[PDB]
Design a protein around this ligand. Structure first.
Ligand SMILES: Nc1ncnc2c1ncn2[C@@H]1O[C@H](COP(=O)(O)OP(=O)(O)O)[C@@H](O)[C@H]1O
Ligand SMILES: [Mg+2]
Length: 321
Protein backbone atom coordinates (compact mmCIF):
# COMPACT_ATOMS: atom_id res chain seq x y z
CA UNK A 1 0.00 0.00 0.00
CA UNK A 2 2.90 2.39 0.75
CA UNK A 3 1.25 4.32 3.54
CA UNK A 4 3.27 6.14 6.22
CA UNK A 5 1.34 5.86 9.49
CA UNK A 6 2.66 9.26 10.66
CA UNK A 7 0.15 11.19 8.52
CA UNK A 8 -3.33 11.30 10.01
CA UNK A 9 -6.57 13.21 9.71
CA UNK A 10 -6.19 13.58 13.42
CA UNK A 11 -2.84 15.40 13.21
CA UNK A 12 -3.88 17.47 10.22
CA UNK A 13 -4.35 20.98 11.55
CA UNK A 14 -7.25 22.82 9.96
CA UNK A 15 -7.37 26.48 8.97
CA UNK A 16 -9.36 28.36 6.40
CA UNK A 17 -6.71 27.56 3.84
CA UNK A 18 -7.17 23.78 3.89
CA UNK A 19 -10.70 23.38 5.21
CA UNK A 20 -12.42 22.57 1.87
CA UNK A 21 -9.95 19.86 0.98
CA UNK A 22 -10.11 18.51 4.51
CA UNK A 23 -13.89 18.56 4.68
CA UNK A 24 -14.31 17.05 1.22
CA UNK A 25 -11.87 14.25 1.97
CA UNK A 26 -13.73 13.55 5.23
CA UNK A 27 -17.16 13.61 3.62
CA UNK A 28 -15.74 11.17 1.06
CA UNK A 29 -14.53 8.74 3.70
CA UNK A 30 -18.05 8.43 5.03
CA UNK A 31 -19.40 7.56 1.60
CA UNK A 32 -16.41 6.06 -0.23
CA UNK A 33 -16.68 6.30 -4.00
CA UNK A 34 -20.27 7.51 -3.88
CA UNK A 35 -20.23 11.24 -3.20
CA UNK A 36 -17.14 12.63 -4.87
CA UNK A 37 -15.18 10.81 -7.51
CA UNK A 38 -12.68 11.77 -8.24
CA UNK A 39 -11.28 14.19 -5.71
CA UNK A 40 -8.43 16.26 -7.16
CA UNK A 41 -6.42 18.25 -4.63
CA UNK A 42 -3.96 20.92 -5.76
CA UNK A 43 -1.62 23.41 -4.15
CA UNK A 44 1.97 24.50 -3.94
CA UNK A 45 4.75 22.57 -2.22
CA UNK A 46 4.44 21.81 1.49
CA UNK A 47 0.80 22.55 1.56
CA UNK A 48 -0.72 19.34 2.87
CA UNK A 49 -1.38 17.32 -0.29
CA UNK A 50 0.66 14.24 0.58
CA UNK A 51 -0.27 14.39 4.22
CA UNK A 52 -3.97 14.52 3.36
CA UNK A 53 -3.84 11.70 0.79
CA UNK A 54 -1.99 9.47 3.19
CA UNK A 55 -4.20 10.33 6.13
CA UNK A 56 -7.22 9.29 4.05
CA UNK A 57 -5.50 6.06 3.11
CA UNK A 58 -4.60 5.27 6.68
CA UNK A 59 -8.23 5.81 7.69
CA UNK A 60 -9.65 3.66 4.93
CA UNK A 61 -7.20 0.92 5.88
CA UNK A 62 -7.93 1.16 9.57
CA UNK A 63 -11.55 0.66 8.54
CA UNK A 64 -10.69 -2.43 6.50
CA UNK A 65 -10.49 -1.09 2.92
CA UNK A 66 -7.93 -2.19 0.33
CA UNK A 67 -5.71 0.83 -0.44
CA UNK A 68 -2.89 1.83 -2.70
CA UNK A 69 -0.86 4.99 -2.54
CA UNK A 70 1.65 5.99 -5.12
CA UNK A 71 3.21 9.05 -6.68
CA UNK A 72 2.70 9.33 -10.39
CA UNK A 73 6.40 9.00 -11.11
CA UNK A 74 6.73 5.76 -9.17
CA UNK A 75 3.51 4.60 -10.82
CA UNK A 76 5.07 5.31 -14.20
CA UNK A 77 8.27 3.58 -13.25
CA UNK A 78 6.45 0.56 -11.86
CA UNK A 79 4.30 0.18 -14.99
CA UNK A 80 7.33 0.18 -17.30
CA UNK A 81 9.00 -2.43 -15.07
CA UNK A 82 6.05 -4.82 -15.11
CA UNK A 83 5.73 -4.31 -18.85
CA UNK A 84 9.23 -5.56 -19.56
CA UNK A 85 9.08 -8.35 -16.98
CA UNK A 86 5.99 -9.59 -18.79
CA UNK A 87 3.69 -8.73 -15.92
CA UNK A 88 1.82 -5.65 -17.09
CA UNK A 89 -1.26 -7.71 -16.22
CA UNK A 90 -0.45 -8.02 -12.50
CA UNK A 91 0.14 -4.27 -12.56
CA UNK A 92 -3.39 -3.56 -13.78
CA UNK A 93 -5.16 -6.14 -11.66
CA UNK A 94 -3.38 -4.77 -8.61
CA UNK A 95 -4.57 -1.24 -9.20
CA UNK A 96 -8.00 -2.26 -10.49
CA UNK A 97 -8.85 -4.09 -7.31
CA UNK A 98 -8.57 -1.46 -4.60
CA UNK A 99 -11.27 0.36 -2.66
CA UNK A 100 -9.11 3.50 -2.54
CA UNK A 101 -6.52 4.68 -5.07
CA UNK A 102 -4.29 7.60 -4.11
CA UNK A 103 -2.22 9.05 -6.93
CA UNK A 104 0.06 11.82 -5.73
CA UNK A 105 1.87 14.42 -7.88
CA UNK A 106 -0.20 13.86 -11.07
CA UNK A 107 1.74 16.58 -12.88
CA UNK A 108 4.50 14.02 -13.47
CA UNK A 109 2.14 12.07 -15.71
CA UNK A 110 3.12 14.47 -18.53
CA UNK A 111 4.90 12.82 -21.42
CA UNK A 112 4.29 9.35 -20.03
CA UNK A 113 1.67 8.49 -22.63
CA UNK A 114 1.54 4.80 -21.91
CA UNK A 115 1.31 5.49 -18.23
CA UNK A 116 -1.56 7.91 -18.85
CA UNK A 117 -3.30 5.35 -21.02
CA UNK A 118 -2.81 2.63 -18.47
CA UNK A 119 -4.04 4.98 -15.71
CA UNK A 120 -7.16 5.89 -17.72
CA UNK A 121 -8.15 2.26 -17.89
CA UNK A 122 -7.53 1.80 -14.18
CA UNK A 123 -9.41 5.06 -13.48
CA UNK A 124 -12.48 3.93 -15.51
CA UNK A 125 -12.58 0.54 -13.80
CA UNK A 126 -12.44 1.90 -10.29
CA UNK A 127 -14.94 4.53 -11.39
CA UNK A 128 -17.51 2.13 -12.89
CA UNK A 129 -17.25 0.21 -9.63
CA UNK A 130 -17.69 3.37 -7.59
CA UNK A 131 -14.23 2.94 -6.06
CA UNK A 132 -12.70 6.07 -4.56
CA UNK A 133 -10.01 7.92 -6.40
CA UNK A 134 -8.06 10.75 -4.85
CA UNK A 135 -5.51 12.65 -6.92
CA UNK A 136 -3.15 15.39 -5.88
CA UNK A 137 -1.19 17.81 -8.01
CA UNK A 138 0.81 20.97 -7.72
CA UNK A 139 -1.40 22.62 -10.28
CA UNK A 140 -4.98 22.79 -11.50
CA UNK A 141 -5.93 20.24 -14.19
CA UNK A 142 -6.27 23.11 -16.71
CA UNK A 143 -2.53 23.59 -16.25
CA UNK A 144 -1.58 19.99 -16.78
CA UNK A 145 0.30 20.33 -20.07
CA UNK A 146 1.18 16.94 -21.47
CA UNK A 147 -1.70 15.07 -19.83
CA UNK A 148 -4.38 13.86 -22.20
CA UNK A 149 -7.58 15.84 -22.59
CA UNK A 150 -9.71 12.89 -21.70
CA UNK A 151 -7.96 12.44 -18.37
CA UNK A 152 -8.44 16.12 -17.72
CA UNK A 153 -12.19 16.03 -18.46
CA UNK A 154 -12.55 13.05 -16.21
CA UNK A 155 -10.81 14.87 -13.38
CA UNK A 156 -13.09 17.78 -14.04
CA UNK A 157 -16.13 15.61 -13.61
CA UNK A 158 -15.28 15.28 -9.95
CA UNK A 159 -14.37 17.79 -7.26
CA UNK A 160 -11.37 20.09 -7.53
CA UNK A 161 -10.12 21.77 -4.38
CA UNK A 162 -7.17 24.10 -3.97
CA UNK A 163 -5.20 23.72 -0.75
CA UNK A 164 -3.16 26.36 1.06
CA UNK A 165 -1.07 26.59 4.19
CA UNK A 166 -2.28 29.84 5.70
CA UNK A 167 -0.63 31.95 8.43
CA UNK A 168 -2.95 30.87 11.23
CA UNK A 169 -2.07 27.29 10.32
CA UNK A 170 1.75 27.63 10.10
CA UNK A 171 1.54 29.34 13.46
CA UNK A 172 -0.12 26.32 15.06
CA UNK A 173 2.30 24.02 13.25
CA UNK A 174 5.25 26.09 14.41
CA UNK A 175 4.09 25.60 17.98
CA UNK A 176 3.83 21.85 17.47
CA UNK A 177 7.32 21.77 15.92
CA UNK A 178 8.91 23.72 18.74
CA UNK A 179 7.54 21.11 21.20
CA UNK A 180 8.71 18.30 18.87
CA UNK A 181 12.27 19.59 18.91
CA UNK A 182 12.30 20.69 22.53
CA UNK A 183 12.39 24.43 22.13
CA UNK A 184 10.44 26.98 24.06
CA UNK A 185 7.24 28.60 22.84
CA UNK A 186 8.79 32.02 23.11
CA UNK A 187 7.21 34.91 21.24
CA UNK A 188 10.41 35.94 19.41
CA UNK A 189 11.13 32.45 18.15
CA UNK A 190 7.55 31.88 17.03
CA UNK A 191 7.63 35.29 15.41
CA UNK A 192 11.01 34.65 13.77
CA UNK A 193 9.65 31.49 12.26
CA UNK A 194 6.42 33.12 11.04
CA UNK A 195 8.33 35.76 9.13
CA UNK A 196 10.90 33.38 7.62
CA UNK A 197 9.10 30.21 6.56
CA UNK A 198 6.22 28.90 4.46
CA UNK A 199 6.88 25.14 4.65
CA UNK A 200 7.45 22.70 7.46
CA UNK A 201 10.70 21.95 5.62
CA UNK A 202 11.87 25.53 6.17
CA UNK A 203 10.63 25.45 9.74
CA UNK A 204 12.67 22.33 10.47
CA UNK A 205 15.60 23.87 8.61
CA UNK A 206 15.52 26.94 10.86
CA UNK A 207 15.03 24.78 13.95
CA UNK A 208 18.09 22.67 13.02
CA UNK A 209 20.12 25.89 12.88
CA UNK A 210 18.65 27.07 16.16
CA UNK A 211 19.58 23.89 18.03
CA UNK A 212 23.09 24.16 16.59
CA UNK A 213 23.92 27.80 17.05
CA UNK A 214 21.28 28.86 19.55
CA UNK A 215 18.42 31.16 18.54
CA UNK A 216 20.64 34.19 19.11
CA UNK A 217 23.48 32.52 17.22
CA UNK A 218 21.25 32.28 14.16
CA UNK A 219 20.26 35.91 14.48
CA UNK A 220 23.93 36.87 14.62
CA UNK A 221 24.87 34.68 11.69
CA UNK A 222 21.98 36.02 9.63
CA UNK A 223 22.88 39.60 10.50
CA UNK A 224 26.38 38.97 9.28
CA UNK A 225 25.03 37.47 6.07
CA UNK A 226 22.94 40.62 5.49
CA UNK A 227 26.02 42.77 6.09
CA UNK A 228 27.92 40.87 3.46
CA UNK A 229 25.12 41.34 0.93
CA UNK A 230 25.42 45.04 1.59
CA UNK A 231 29.17 44.80 1.11
CA UNK A 232 28.46 43.35 -2.32
CA UNK A 233 26.23 46.32 -3.10
CA UNK A 234 28.99 48.70 -1.99
CA UNK A 235 31.26 46.72 -4.30
CA UNK A 236 29.16 46.85 -7.47
CA UNK A 237 28.91 50.57 -6.76
CA UNK A 238 32.57 51.60 -6.48
CA UNK A 239 33.14 49.64 -9.70
CA UNK A 240 30.14 50.83 -11.75
CA UNK A 241 30.21 54.43 -10.57
CA UNK A 242 26.77 54.44 -8.96
CA UNK A 243 26.02 55.34 -5.35
CA UNK A 244 24.53 52.88 -2.88
CA UNK A 245 21.50 55.02 -2.08
CA UNK A 246 20.95 54.87 -5.83
CA UNK A 247 21.51 51.14 -6.49
CA UNK A 248 18.56 50.36 -4.19
CA UNK A 249 15.37 51.28 -6.09
CA UNK A 250 13.24 50.77 -9.21
CA UNK A 251 14.98 53.63 -11.00
CA UNK A 252 15.28 52.34 -14.56
CA UNK A 253 18.47 54.04 -15.78
CA UNK A 254 20.51 51.26 -17.44
CA UNK A 255 23.37 52.80 -15.44
CA UNK A 256 21.69 51.51 -12.33
CA UNK A 257 19.28 48.89 -13.64
CA UNK A 258 22.31 47.09 -15.08
CA UNK A 259 24.19 47.34 -11.79
CA UNK A 260 21.16 46.04 -9.95
CA UNK A 261 21.22 42.92 -12.10
CA UNK A 262 24.85 41.99 -11.53
CA UNK A 263 24.54 42.78 -7.82
CA UNK A 264 21.58 40.47 -7.31
CA UNK A 265 23.60 38.01 -9.39
CA UNK A 266 26.61 38.45 -7.14
CA UNK A 267 24.48 38.08 -4.00
CA UNK A 268 23.01 34.95 -5.49
CA UNK A 269 26.17 33.45 -6.93
CA UNK A 270 28.88 34.71 -4.58
CA UNK A 271 27.16 34.61 -1.17
CA UNK A 272 24.60 31.87 -1.87
CA UNK A 273 21.73 34.07 -0.73
CA UNK A 274 18.22 32.87 -1.36
CA UNK A 275 15.87 34.77 -3.66
CA UNK A 276 13.84 35.94 -0.70
CA UNK A 277 17.06 37.05 1.01
CA UNK A 278 18.30 38.85 -2.07
CA UNK A 279 14.86 40.39 -2.56
CA UNK A 280 14.91 41.60 1.04
CA UNK A 281 18.42 42.93 0.67
CA UNK A 282 17.40 45.03 -2.29
CA UNK A 283 14.45 46.78 -0.73
CA UNK A 284 11.49 45.26 -2.52
CA UNK A 285 9.14 42.37 -1.87
CA UNK A 286 7.99 40.07 -4.65
CA UNK A 287 9.08 37.27 -6.97
CA UNK A 288 9.39 38.12 -10.67
CA UNK A 289 12.01 40.91 -10.51
CA UNK A 290 14.92 38.79 -9.29
CA UNK A 291 14.31 35.57 -11.23
CA UNK A 292 14.41 37.15 -14.71
CA UNK A 293 17.09 39.61 -13.64
CA UNK A 294 19.42 36.71 -12.95
CA UNK A 295 18.11 35.27 -16.24
CA UNK A 296 19.16 38.29 -18.29
CA UNK A 297 22.62 37.92 -16.77
CA UNK A 298 22.74 34.39 -18.18
CA UNK A 299 21.61 35.66 -21.58
CA UNK A 300 24.96 37.40 -21.74
CA UNK A 301 26.67 34.01 -21.52
CA UNK A 302 25.81 33.15 -25.12
CA UNK A 303 33.16 34.56 -24.07
CA UNK A 304 32.31 38.23 -23.59
CA UNK A 305 30.18 39.56 -20.72
CA UNK A 306 31.11 36.36 -18.88
CA UNK A 307 34.68 37.43 -18.09
CA UNK A 308 33.51 40.67 -16.54
CA UNK A 309 31.00 39.04 -14.21
CA UNK A 310 33.62 36.38 -13.61
CA UNK A 311 36.12 38.99 -12.52
CA UNK A 312 33.54 40.73 -10.32
CA UNK A 313 32.70 37.39 -8.69
CA UNK A 314 36.32 36.75 -7.78
CA UNK A 315 36.93 40.23 -6.40
CA UNK A 316 33.71 40.17 -4.38
CA UNK A 317 34.83 36.83 -2.91
CA UNK A 318 38.29 38.01 -1.85
CA UNK A 319 36.88 41.26 -0.45
CA UNK A 320 33.68 40.08 1.20
CA UNK A 321 33.96 36.35 1.94
N1 LIG B 1 -2.43 21.15 8.06
C1 LIG B 1 -1.28 20.58 8.47
N2 LIG B 1 -1.11 20.22 9.75
C2 LIG B 1 0.03 19.66 10.19
N3 LIG B 1 1.08 19.42 9.38
C3 LIG B 1 1.04 19.72 8.08
C4 LIG B 1 -0.17 20.33 7.53
N4 LIG B 1 0.05 20.54 6.23
C5 LIG B 1 1.31 20.08 5.95
N5 LIG B 1 1.89 19.60 7.07
C6 LIG B 1 3.24 19.02 7.18
O1 LIG B 1 4.15 19.69 6.30
C7 LIG B 1 4.96 18.73 5.59
C8 LIG B 1 4.69 18.81 4.11
O2 LIG B 1 3.44 18.16 3.92
P1 LIG B 1 3.06 17.54 2.50
O3 LIG B 1 1.73 16.83 2.60
O4 LIG B 1 4.17 16.66 1.96
O5 LIG B 1 2.96 18.83 1.57
P2 LIG B 1 2.90 18.65 0.00
O6 LIG B 1 2.59 17.16 -0.23
O7 LIG B 1 1.78 19.58 -0.38
O8 LIG B 1 4.25 19.06 -0.50
C9 LIG B 1 4.55 17.37 6.11
O9 LIG B 1 5.44 17.08 7.17
C10 LIG B 1 3.15 17.61 6.64
O10 LIG B 1 2.70 16.71 7.64
MG1 LIG C 1 3.52 16.00 -1.34
Amino acid sequence: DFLNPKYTLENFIVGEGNRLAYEVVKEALENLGSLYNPIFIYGSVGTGKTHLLQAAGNEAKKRGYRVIYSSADDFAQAMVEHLKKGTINEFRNMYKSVDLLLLDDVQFLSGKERTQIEFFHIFNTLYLLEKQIILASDRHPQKLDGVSDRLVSRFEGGILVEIELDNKTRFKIIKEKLKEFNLELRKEVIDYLLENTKNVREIEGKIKLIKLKGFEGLERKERKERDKLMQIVEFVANYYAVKVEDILSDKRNKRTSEARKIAMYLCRKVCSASLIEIARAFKRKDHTTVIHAIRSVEEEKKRKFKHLVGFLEKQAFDKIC
